[PDB]
């Protein structure tokens, strides 16, 4: 079915699945999460509360047992998903902390992208900051490798950037996009990396020991921007085997990573689109829209 | 032909109830089968015990005929609808109005409920029907299109939800919602003072002084005739065991078999005592819970109870 | 007749019976009105001749003049005769089940009570005047679109906002006007029963 | 009472951003012409324009075809008797009292079993658009409608308010003109409005082509021909439009002449191509020859 | 065209549905019973 | 295999349309075989535009369904000398060349516009009469007429 | 529509009562069928009255 | 053919693939419709959502 | 000049019905003066 969800108040800018495929949490402008279950009737069971700010991009661990979420007033937060409260208020941020990202299998860490200046690497534990690289200006998205070793980062100069871990320097820095980059995901292969950007393109690159110098993979064609500047997200699939994009077009874009071509771009939203979520089980898309509420396709 | 009837028992009177002060026009029974009702002329409302036949109760408001009565499954309410255009919502813990629904510009002539939302219908003179809500009192819709007096009116669940037919000689299939007719039949060639329901088979027949008629839900497509009875018809009651009984108003009334409609029976009962022989008629026939006895509410002041007749067999009384 | 496919050179069809059996010549450099063909005529007012799905002339377009396809009109003589449908088994005739009926019910109930509530709102007048709701955003394109104007642009998005009403002000126009009632619905095909004859006897009688 | 969701308005009076802001109110004001109570949109139509406003009922605009303001047909734009005229139609919409409102219940009534797509009545019968109205129709945006009005006292003198005279403070209009005094009710009644006058006369002194005198005169003299034309091109703007007989594609003076076979089939043809036979951008001159 | 006018008998009154309980005569037991 | 007359004897009237394989021998050998073929039964007028063209023969009955015999669809044969100067020329019209597939066009006037665009493959042999009472019929604003106006037979020449 | 009062009862009665007897047989058990006189039935019926209280 | 939706048919609910979703219509547009005729069209002049 | 319905005779069809198309063409019919 179609399956379309509401209860949100304004935007919902950020949905994503339970690492389980069990729950769902959807956030926005409403500065409060909401909770539901994916299967039965898709019904909600819990609120989480306290972000004084918009909740801007939310972020599961890989187990699904504590949730990261960053907020629009300076703050990060981690939650605990068996109760939804704080354990911690990731302070310390010297502006809009827009990105979050913690460390898939590694050492618990994070790295958060900001409107400050810096990307922060932060301890869980210590509330305390890890390490900090000021390269000038907003960071708008961040995500980790899979080595827990380099940090990846695009904003507004539209040079993507990694710095090493253990010597803090502009590891690798790409360019080929022609305005801001707006949304890093990496595949579950741990080196394909998808890179969405309002210039109405689409990248895919890959972070490996021996990577061409230049790598620059596979380029798609749809994405969107206007007035708005809203923040566009991507995602691969479980898989990586469909590329899915939202665009402040209203239009569900669904690509695949094999032959690039246009699988969809479906209709049924009312405001931009603004994240896409897949389950990690099923062919199940969740999105997440400024028109209130999300959508639950299947194909 | 037809295939051969069914065998149905013949019935026979075996009550005479008298104790109104004009014609007795509207019948019902309770829910749980234990009373029954009647409006009359005399514009009151008498409640009688239906084991007994005694008298229960004398509820006396109108301010003319009560041409209508009904009682609610759903809520302990009794609704009854006069010749003084208004309609009344009688609740019976206390014996008491507590509700009137107003807007109708003459007499009502007939009224129904709707069995699983509420709503009343009302069908009246002025060539109108309505649907009341029955707990704001507001007439939700004005089921307007006819063009003489709304004699009858019937509602049910399943679509189209109502049917009203009239002295225009014509029979309406409205829907509720939309509140607007779908189907207009106009087979008959005198005014259209009855109409029932099959209680389960998605059918409906409709009596007027040419012939009965049969038809077919959803749409009302036209399956059969039922003639023999030229007289002015006032009722039709069906049993769920297939009888249909058609009372007229010269007093005469047809047993018929609902699905070959083979007439079985014809009774032409005796007027009381004082009466004149120009004073026999039969305005309602109602079955009761059990569908085991039949009550009439007659043109001479009585109400006559038929039980089936248990020592009749095929060979007895065969079946033409 | 219309000259060999080939050899159907120099000769320009004027009148159709060089059409032969019918046709139009596409290589002859003439506009060919091949039995009746090519000539806009006059709007005429007579509404479409249809015909059925066997070649029958469908004269239920007369009685159903000016009304929707919901509208079932019988007017043919086929619905009259009795339909042997003396049968206590067929399910063809059983009622809908249950569980559909209930959803007619939950519709139903919703679109007649929301209406009562507008119905009865009005007879609380005493109007509980709630917030007017925020504003909406509508994306309009014009059909005159092009760049002579809208500045290039196809579509042009508006904010709507509803204006305050004064609690204090009486009502503004005079409701009660009188009009004779409009003509009704398109009169229905009488189908009765053929009338039978009335002696002289009986109308003296 | 009516309710919309919109209004239906020309893209002149709309205005020029793309971007809108818009007031309803409802029940707001009675119709001028269906008399009846309406909901009022409010619009500002640009900076230092005037507020304009939706000033007669959907129903009476669904009607006749018009923008609720701007009163101008929604298609070509003209006033509504020149468009009505030059659809050759016969607008039989009542004009007395009693007669005018009974008809306006029922038009409303029937209007009402609509999908709210186009116009009801001729007004789907009549769309065939004669070459006259393409040709009277407005080109781009005369947006000098909304502009404020005439500052009595800037006029006198005495506008007071320094630049912010509520009205523009220039001359006033001579109340002599025709084009002065046009009342709402006969401007969508189309009886005696005098822009439509003007606007006829103006097609009527509009260049067409000329017939000749003789029926034996069937060579048809095309001007400015151009040497980017074929023979067989000519004849594909003269072929199918009935037959022809010969054509003399001059180029020693880049004309044309087409024998016909048919007098009615290249009257036509000519008459429509009158300076507007746009083939290959060659104004051609479609006359009759000597 | 919805008037303003009002009514002494438009009040609000009697605004709760009574349903027939369990002992009265519910639909469940007239279903049930003999 | 060149059928000469296909007869489609419509609800509306009869007809047979000529098709010259010589002008036009893929469009021609298609058409034969799909009337043969009995494919076309149950296609609604896709398109009736008045005294311009009576399109039909859509799986679909909405305009983005027809096969062709050869797949989906196949290229345009051309003539130089054929055109659509007068009714009834039966021409499968394209929304790209060589993607002709089983939508059917009939010409009812003058079309020197289809020349180039669509294939004009034959003239329609029987029923002019019935063509021009069609194309006078009312139609919706999609052009898919308000009366579901269909083809009882569809049948090529013996 | 206003109600039937105390002063409308008797007026109130007889318009009813002749509405139904115009239903009744003048339109329902006719075949005098070319104008079947329910205008002039209606006089008889007021005379019958008129005849009863005058024993 | 495949799977194909009518165009005028706006209420979906089916998932459809591009081209299951945004196949073109075959055939010529009638040259008989202005602009306003021409157009998508929810309202009389124009569609607004 | 204040009469509110006289004029509903004299100047127009009072309350004008068009007959019913069907089947055959009205158009070129029309008919004589007196």
């Given at each position: 079915?179609?399956?379309?969800?509401?209860?949100?108040?304004?935007?919902?800018?950020?949905?994503?699945?339970?690492?389980?495929?069990?729950?769902?949490?959807?956030?926005?402008?409403?500065?409060?999460?909401?909770?539901?279950?994916?299967?039965?009737?898709?019904?909600?069971?819990?609120?989480?509360?306290?972000?004084?700010?918009?909740?801007?991009?939310?972020?599961?661990?890989?187990?699904?047992?504590?949730?990261?979420?960053?907020?629009?007033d300076?703050?990060?937060?981690?939650?605990?998903?068996?109760?939804?409260?704080?354990?911690?208020?990731?302070?310390g941020?010297?502006?809009?902390?827009?990105?979050?990202?913690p460390?898939?299998?590694?050492?618990?860490?994070?790295?958060?992208?900001?409107?400050?200046?810096?990307?922060k690497?932060?301890?869980?534990?210590?509330?305390?900051?890890?390490?900090?690289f000021?390269?000038?200006?907003?960071?708008?998205?961040?995500?980790?490798?899979?080595?827990?070793?380099?940090?990846?980062?695009?904003?507004?100069?539209?040079?993507?950037?990694?710095?090493?871990?253990?010597?803090?320097?502009?590891?690798?820095?790409?360019?080929?996009?022609?305005?801001?980059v707006?949304?890093?995901?990496?595949?579950?292969?741990?080196?394909?990396?998808?890179?969405?950007?309002?210039?109405?393109?689409?990248?895919?690159?890959?972070?490996?020991?021996?990577?061409?110098?230049?790598?620059?993979?596979?380029?798609?064609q749809?994405?969107v921007?206007?007035?708005?500047?809203?923040?566009?997200?991507?995602?691969?699939?479980?898989?990586?085997?469909?590329?899915?994009?939202?665009?402040?077009?209203?239009?569900?874009?669904?690509?695949?990573?094999?032959?690039?071509?246009?699988?969809?771009?479906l209709?049924?939203?009312?405001?931009?689109?603004?994240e896409?979520?897949?389950?990690?089980?099923?062919?199940?898309?969740?999105?997440?829209?400024?028109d209130?509420?999300?959508?639950?396709?299947?194909? | 032909?037809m295939?051969?009837?069914?065998?149905?028992?013949?019935?026979?009177?075996?009550?005479?109830?008298?104790?109104?002060?004009?014609?007795?026009?509207?019948?019902?029974?309770?829910?749980?089968?234990?009373?029954?009702?009647?409006?009359?002329?005399?514009?009151?409302?008498?409640?009688?015990?239906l084991?007994?036949?005694?008298?229960?109760?004398?509820?006396?408001?109108?301010?003319?005929?009560?041409?209508?009565?009904?009682?609610?499954?759903?809520?302990?309410?009794?609704?009854?609808?006069?010749?003084?255009?208004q309609?009344?919502?009688?609740?019976?813990?206390?014996?008491?109005?507590?509700?009137?629904?107003?807007?109708?510009?003459?007499?009502?002539?007939?009224?129904?409920?709707?069995?699983?939302?509420?709503?009343?219908?009302?069908?009246?003179?002025?060539?109108?029907?309505?649907?009341?809500?029955?707990?704001t009192?507001?007439?939700?819709?004005?089921?307007s299109?006819?063009?003489?007096?709304?004699?009858?009116?019937?509602?049910?669940?399943?679509?189209?939800?109502?049917?009203?037919?009239?002295?225009?000689?014509?029979?309406?299939?409205?829907?509720?919602?939309?509140?607007?007719?779908?189907?207009?039949?106009?087979?008959?060639?005198?005014?259209?003072?009855?109409?029932?329901?099959?209680?389960?088979?998605?059918?409906?027949?409709?009596?007027?002084?040419?012939?009965?008629?049969?038809?077919?839900?959803?749409?009302?497509?036209?399956?059969?005739?039922?003639?023999?009875?030229?007289?002015?018809?006032?009722?039709?009651?069906?049993?769920?065991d297939?009888?249909?009984?058609?009372?007229?108003?010269?007093?005469?009334?047809?047993?018929?078999?609902?699905?070959?409609?083979?007439?079985?029976?014809?009774?032409?009962?005796?007027?009381?005592?004082?009466?004149?022989?120009?004073?026999?008629?039969?305005?309602?026939?109602?079955?009761?819970?059990?569908?085991?006895?039949?009550?009439?509410?007659?043109?001479?002041?009585?109400?006559?109870?038929?039980?089936?007749?248990?020592?009749?067999?095929?060979?007895?009384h065969?079946?033409? | 007749?219309?000259?060999p496919?080939?050899?159907?050179?120099?000769?320009?069809?004027?009148?159709?019976?060089?059409?032969?059996?019918?046709?139009?010549?596409?290589?002859?450099?003439?506009?060919?009105?091949?039995?009746?063909?090519?000539?806009?005529?006059?709007?005429?007012?007579?509404?479409?001749?249809?015909?059925?799905?066997?070649?029958?002339?469908?004269?239920?377009?007369?009685?159903?003049?000016?009304?929707?396809?919901?509208?079932?009109?019988?007017?043919?003589?086929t619905?009259?005769?009795?339909?042997?449908?003396?049968?206590?088994?067929?399910?063809?005739?059983?009622?809908?089940?249950?569980?559909?009926?209930?959803?007619?019910?939950?519709?139903?109930?919703?679109?007649?009570?929301?209406?009562?509530?507008?119905?009865?709102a009005?007879?609380?007048?005493?109007?509980?005047?709630?917030?007017?709701?925020?504003?909406?955003?509508?994306?309009?394109?014009?059909?005159?679109?092009?760049?002579?104007?809208?500045?290039?642009?196809?579509?042009?998005?508006?904010?709507?906002?509803?204006?305050?009403?004064?609690?204090?002000?009486?009502?503004?126009?005079?409701?009660?006007?009188?009009?004779?009632?409009?003509?009704?619905?398109?009169?229905?095909?009488?189908?009765?029963?053929?009338?039978?004859?009335?002696?002289?006897?009986?109308?003296q009688? | 009472?009516?309710?919309?969701?919109?209004?239906?308005?020309?893209?002149?009076?709309?205005?020029?951003?793309?971007?809108?802001?818009?007031?309803?109110?409802?029940?707001?004001?009675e119709?001028?012409?269906?008399?009846?109570?309406?909901?009022?949109?409010?619009?500002?139509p640009?900076?230092?324009?005037?507020?304009?406003?939706?000033?007669?009922?959907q129903?009476?605009?669904?009607?006749?075809?018009?923008?609720?303001?701007?009163?101008?047909?929604?298609?070509?734009?003209?006033?509504?008797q020149?468009?009505?005229?030059?659809?050759?139609?016969?607008?039989?919409?009542?004009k007395?009292?009693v007669?005018?409102?009974?008809?306006?219940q029922?038009?409303?009534?029937?209007?009402?079993?609509?999908?709210?797509?186009?116009?009801?009545?001729?007004?789907?019968?009549?769309?065939?658009?004669?070459?006259?109205?393409?040709?009277?129709?407005?080109?781009?945006?005369?947006?000098?409608?909304?502009?404020?009005?005439?500052?009595?006292?800037?006029?006198?003198?005495?506008?007071?308010?320094?630049?912010?005279?509520?009205?523009?403070?220039?001359?006033?209009?001579?109340?002599?003109?025709?084009?002065?005094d046009?009342?709402?009710?006969?401007?969508?009644?189309?009886?005696?409005?005098?822009?439509?006058?003007?606007?006829?006369?103006?097609?009527?002194?509009?260049?067409?082509?000329?017939?000749?005198?003789?029926?034996?005169?069937?060579?048809?003299?095309?001007?400015?021909?151009?040497?980017?034309?074929?023979?067989?091109?000519?004849?594909?703007?003269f072929?199918?439009?009935?037959?022809?007989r010969?054509?003399?594609?001059?180029?020693?003076?880049?004309?044309?002449?087409?024998?016909?076979?048919?007098?009615?089939?290249?009257?036509?043809?000519?008459?429509?191509?009158?300076?507007?036979?746009?083939?290959?951008?060659?104004?051609l001159?479609?006359?009759?020859?000597? | 065209?919805?008037?303003?006018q009002?009514?002494?008998?438009?009040?609000p009154?009697?605004?709760?549905?009574?349903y027939?309980?369990?002992?009265?005569?519910?639909?469940?037991?007239?279903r049930?019973?003999? | 295999?060149?059928?000469p007359?296909?007869?489609?004897?419509?609800?509306?009237?009869?007809?047979?349309?000529?098709?010259?394989?010589?002008?036009?021998?893929?469009?021609?050998?298609?058409?034969?075989?799909?009337?043969?073929?009995?494919?076309?039964?149950?296609?609604?007028?896709?398109?009736?535009?008045?005294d311009?063209?009576?399109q039909?023969?859509?799986?679909?009955?909405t305009?983005?369904?027809?096969?062709?015999?050869?797949?989906?669809?196949?290229?345009?044969?051309?003539?130089?000398?054929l055109?659509?100067?007068?009714?009834?020329?039966?021409?499968?019209?394209?929304?790209?060349?060589?993607?002709?597939?089983?939508?059917?066009?009939?010409?009812?006037?003058?079309?020197?516009?289809?020349?180039?665009?669509?294939?004009i493959?034959?003239?329609?042999?029987?029923?002019?009469?019935?063509?021009?009472?069609?194309?006078?019929?009312?139609?919706?604003?999609?052009?898919?007429?308000?009366?579901?106006?269909?083809?009882i037979?569809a049948?090529?020449?013996? | 529509?206003?109600?039937?009062?105390?002063?409308?009862?008797?007026?109130?009665?007889?318009?009813?009562?002749?509405?139904?007897?115009?239903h009744?047989?003048?339109?329902?058990?006719?075949?005098?069928?070319?104008?079947?006189?329910?205008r002039?039935?209606?006089?008889?019926?007021?005379?019958?009255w008129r005849?009863?209280?005058?024993? | 053919?495949?799977?194909?939706?009518?165009?005028?048919?706006?209420?979906?609910?089916?998932?459809?693939?591009?081209?299951?979703?945004?196949?073109?219509?075959?055939?010529?547009?009638?040259?008989?419709?202005?602009?306003?005729?021409?157009?998508?069209?929810?309202?009389?002049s124009?569609?607004?959502? | 000049?204040?009469?509110?319905?006289?004029?509903?005779?004299?100047?127009?069809?009072?309350?004008?019905?068009?007959?019913?198309?069907?089947?055959?063409?009205?158009?070129?019919?029309?008919?004589?003066?007196?």
């Amino acid at each position: 079915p179609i399956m379309l969800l509401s209860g949100h108040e304004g935007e919902v800018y950020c949905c994503k699945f339970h690492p389980n495929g069990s729950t769902l949490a959807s956030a926005g402008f409403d500065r409060l999460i909401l909770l539901w279950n994916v299967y039965g009737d898709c019904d909600n069971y819990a609120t989480l509360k306290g972000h004084s700010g918009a909740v801007m991009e939310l972020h599961y661990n890989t187990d699904g047992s504590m949730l990261f979420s960053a907020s629009t007033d300076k703050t990060v937060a981690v939650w605990d998903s068996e109760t939804g409260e704080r354990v911690k208020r990731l302070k310390g941020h010297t502006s809009f902390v827009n990105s979050c990202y913690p460390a898939r299998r590694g050492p618990q860490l994070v790295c958060t992208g900001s409107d400050d200046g810096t990307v922060k690497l932060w301890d869980i534990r210590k509330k305390a900051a890890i390490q900090t690289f000021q390269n000038t200006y907003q960071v708008l998205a961040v995500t980790f490798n899979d080595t827990s070793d380099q940090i990846i980062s695009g904003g507004i100069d539209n040079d993507i950037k990694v710095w090493d871990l253990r010597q803090n320097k502009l590891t690798y820095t790409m360019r080929g996009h022609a305005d801001s980059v707006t949304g890093l995901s990496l595949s579950s292969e741990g080196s394909y990396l998808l890179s969405n950007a309002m210039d109405n393109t689409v990248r895919v690159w890959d972070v490996r020991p021996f990577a061409p110098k230049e790598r620059c993979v596979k380029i798609f064609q749809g994405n969107v921007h206007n007035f708005e500047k809203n923040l566009l997200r991507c995602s691969w699939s479980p898989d990586g085997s469909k590329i899915a994009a939202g665009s402040a077009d209203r239009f569900v874009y669904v690509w695949d990573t094999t032959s690039r071509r246009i699988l969809y771009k479906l209709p049924g939203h009312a405001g931009s689109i603004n994240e896409v979520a897949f389950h990690p089980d099923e062919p199940i898309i969740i999105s997440a829209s400024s028109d209130k509420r999300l959508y639950m396709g299947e194909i | 032909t037809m295939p051969k009837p069914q065998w149905h028992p013949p019935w026979k009177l075996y009550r005479v109830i008298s104790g109104h002060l004009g014609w007795v026009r509207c019948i019902a029974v309770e829910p749980g089968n234990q009373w029954f009702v009647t409006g009359s002329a005399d514009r009151t409302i008498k409640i009688w015990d239906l084991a007994s036949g005694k008298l229960k109760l004398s509820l006396t408001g109108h301010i003319s005929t009560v041409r209508g009565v009904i009682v609610s499954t759903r809520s302990p309410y009794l609704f009854s609808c006069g010749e003084d255009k208004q309609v009344k919502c009688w609740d019976l813990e206390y014996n008491k109005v507590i509700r009137h629904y107003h807007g109708h510009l003459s007499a009502v002539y007939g009224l129904d409920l709707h069995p699983t939302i509420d709503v009343l219908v009302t069908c009246s003179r002025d060539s109108t029907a309505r649907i009341w809500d029955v707990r704001t009192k507001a007439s939700v819709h004005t089921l307007s299109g006819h063009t003489n007096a709304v004699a009858t009116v019937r509602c049910q669940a399943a679509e189209p939800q109502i049917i009203t037919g009239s002295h225009d000689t014509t029979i309406r299939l409205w829907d509720l919602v939309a509140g607007k007719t779908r189907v207009t039949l106009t087979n008959h060639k005198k005014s259209v003072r009855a109409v029932v329901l099959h209680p389960r088979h998605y059918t409906f027949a409709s009596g007027s002084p040419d012939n009965i008629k049969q038809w077919k839900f959803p749409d009302g497509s036209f399956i059969q005739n039922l003639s023999g009875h030229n007289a002015i018809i006032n009722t039709l009651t069906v049993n769920s065991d297939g009888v249909l009984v058609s009372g007229a108003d010269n007093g005469t009334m047809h047993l018929w078999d609902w699905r070959t409609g083979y007439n079985f029976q014809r009774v032409h009962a005796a007027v009381q005592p004082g009466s004149l022989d120009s004073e026999s008629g039969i305005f309602a026939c109602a079955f009761d819970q059990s569908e085991s006895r039949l009550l009439t509410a007659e043109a001479d002041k009585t109400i006559k109870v038929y039980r089936e007749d248990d020592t009749a067999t095929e060979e007895t009384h065969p079946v033409s | 007749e219309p000259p060999p496919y080939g050899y159907r050179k120099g000769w320009i069809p004027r009148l159709l019976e060089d059409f032969g059996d019918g046709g139009a010549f596409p290589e002859i450099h003439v506009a060919q009105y091949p039995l009746d063909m090519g000539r806009k005529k006059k709007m005429s007012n007579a509404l479409a001749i249809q015909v059925d799905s066997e070649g029958k002339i469908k004269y239920d377009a007369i009685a159903r003049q000016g009304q929707s396809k919901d509208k079932v009109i019988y007017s043919k003589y086929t619905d009259l005769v009795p339909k042997e449908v003396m049968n206590a088994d067929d399910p063809d005739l059983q009622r809908p089940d249950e569980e559909a009926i209930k959803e007619i019910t939950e519709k139903t109930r919703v679109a007649l009570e929301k209406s009562v509530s507008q119905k009865v709102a009005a007879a609380m007048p005493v109007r509980a005047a709630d917030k007017l709701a925020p504003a909406q955003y509508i994306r309009y394109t014009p059909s005159q679109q092009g760049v002579a104007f809208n500045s290039g642009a196809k579509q042009r998005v508006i904010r709507m906002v509803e204006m305050q009403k004064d609690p204090m002000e009486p009502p503004r126009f005079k409701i009660n006007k009188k009009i004779p009632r409009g003509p009704p619905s398109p009169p229905a095909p009488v189908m009765h029963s053929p009338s039978r004859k009335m002696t002289v006897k009986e109308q003296q009688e | 009472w009516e309710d919309a969701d919109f209004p239906i308005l020309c893209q002149t009076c709309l205005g020029e951003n793309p971007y809108i802001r818009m007031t309803k109110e409802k029940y707001g004001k009675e119709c001028k012409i269906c008399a009846r109570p309406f909901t009022v949109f409010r619009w500002c139509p640009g900076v230092r324009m005037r507020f304009k406003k939706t000033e007669v009922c959907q129903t009476c605009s669904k009607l006749k075809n018009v923008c609720q303001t701007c009163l101008l047909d929604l298609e070509y734009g003209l006033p509504i008797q020149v468009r009505d005229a030059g659809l050759s139609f016969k607008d039989d919409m009542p004009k007395s009292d009693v007669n005018k409102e009974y008809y306006t219940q029922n038009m409303e009534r029937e209007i009402s079993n609509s999908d709210g797509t186009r116009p009801v009545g001729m007004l789907g019968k009549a769309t065939s658009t004669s070459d006259m109205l393409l040709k009277l129709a407005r080109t781009t945006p005369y947006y000098k409608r909304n502009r404020p009005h005439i500052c009595s006292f800037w006029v006198k003198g005495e506008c007071k308010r320094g630049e912010e005279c509520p009205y523009r403070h220039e001359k006033p209009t001579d109340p002599d003109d025709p084009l002065a005094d046009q009342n709402i009710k006969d401007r969508y009644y189309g009886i005696n409005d005098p822009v439509a006058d003007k606007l006829l006369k103006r097609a009527s002194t509009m260049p067409r082509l000329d017939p000749p005198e003789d029926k034996t005169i069937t060579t048809l003299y095309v001007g400015g021909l151009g040497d980017t034309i074929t023979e067989t091109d000519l004849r594909n703007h003269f072929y199918q439009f009935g037959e022809i007989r010969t054509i003399t594609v001059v180029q020693r003076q880049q004309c044309a002449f087409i024998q016909f076979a048919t007098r009615q089939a290249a009257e036509v043809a000519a008459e429509k191509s009158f300076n507007k036979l746009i083939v290959n951008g060659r104004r051609l001159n479609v006359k009759w020859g000597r | 065209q919805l008037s303003k006018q009002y009514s002494s008998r438009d009040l609000p009154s009697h605004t709760k549905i009574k349903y027939r309980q369990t002992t009265q005569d519910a639909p469940e037991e007239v279903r049930n019973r003999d | 295999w060149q059928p000469p007359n296909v007869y489609l004897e419509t609800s509306m009237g009869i007809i047979v349309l000529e098709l010259y394989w010589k002008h036009a021998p893929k469009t021609c050998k298609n058409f034969a075989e799909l009337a043969r073929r009995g494919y076309y039964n149950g296609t609604k007028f896709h398109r009736i535009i008045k005294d311009f063209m009576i399109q039909g023969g859509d799986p679909t009955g909405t305009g983005r369904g027809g096969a062709s015999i050869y797949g989906k669809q196949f290229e345009d044969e051309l003539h130089p000398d054929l055109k659509f100067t007068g009714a009834g020329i039966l021409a499968m019209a394209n929304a790209g060349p060589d993607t002709n597939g089983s939508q059917f066009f009939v010409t009812l006037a003058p079309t020197q516009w289809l020349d180039g665009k669509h294939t004009i493959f034959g003239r329609v042999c029987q029923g002019i009469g019935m063509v021009n009472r069609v194309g006078m019929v009312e139609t919706n604003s999609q052009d898919r007429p308000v009366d579901d106006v269909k083809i009882i037979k569809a049948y090529p020449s013996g | 529509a206003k109600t039937v009062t105390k002063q409308r009862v008797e007026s109130h009665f007889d318009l009813e009562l002749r509405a139904a007897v115009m239903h009744d047989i003048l339109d329902m058990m006719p075949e005098g069928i070319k104008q079947n006189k329910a205008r002039t039935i209606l006089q008889h019926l007021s005379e019958a009255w008129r005849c009863w209280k005058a024993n | 053919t495949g799977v194909h939706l009518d165009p005028a048919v706006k209420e979906v609910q089916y998932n459809p693939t591009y081209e299951t979703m945004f196949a073109p219509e075959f055939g010529p547009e009638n040259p008989f419709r202005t602009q306003q005729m021409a157009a998508p069209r929810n309202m009389l002049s124009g569609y607004a959502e | 000049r204040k009469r509110k319905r006289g004029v509903d005779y004299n100047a127009e069809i009072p309350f004008e019905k068009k007959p019913a198309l069907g089947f055959y063409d009205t158009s070129e019919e029309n008919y004589q003066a007196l």
